[PDB]
Amino acid sequence: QIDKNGIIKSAQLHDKDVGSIQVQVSLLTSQIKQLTDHLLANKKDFISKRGLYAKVSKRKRLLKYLKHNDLEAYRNLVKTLNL
């Protein structure tokens, strides 16, 4: 379904990042992957594609912030803003 708790806790480095930028962007990226899988398995689900584009946009804005605030976001960039 949501694929929520496991991905959060994998991105949950400490007890001080339950809702941080890191876990949020990880959730959006994991949701992008899961939505691609689903919508390839379920073609005409336009809800999934519109949500995928919305998550892509919100991920872009989250990344622009994460590079505005912390300069170490792109030195270990496993979340490059290209999709």
Partner RNA sequence: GGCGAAGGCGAAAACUUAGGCCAUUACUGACGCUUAGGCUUGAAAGUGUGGGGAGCAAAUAGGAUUAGAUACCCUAGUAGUCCACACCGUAAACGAUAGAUACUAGCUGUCGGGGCGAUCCCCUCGGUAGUGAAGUUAACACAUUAAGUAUCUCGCCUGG
Residues that bind RNA (CB under 7 A): 1-3, 15-21, 24, 31, 34-35, 37-38, 41-51, 53, 55, 58, 61-62, 64-66, 68-69
Q: Which is nearer to RNA, 14 or 78 (CB)?
A: 14
Query: Shortest Cβ distance from residue 74 to RNA (Å)?
Result: 15
Tokens of 30: 């994991």
Give the integer Cα–Cα distance in Å for 25 and 70. Answer: 14
Query: Shortest Cβ distance from residue 13 to RNA (Å)?
Result: 10
Give the integer Cα–Cα distance in Å for 11 and 74. Answer: 17
Nearest to 22 by CA among 78, 48, 35: 78
Query: Shortest Cβ distance from residue 78 to RNA (Å)?
Result: 18
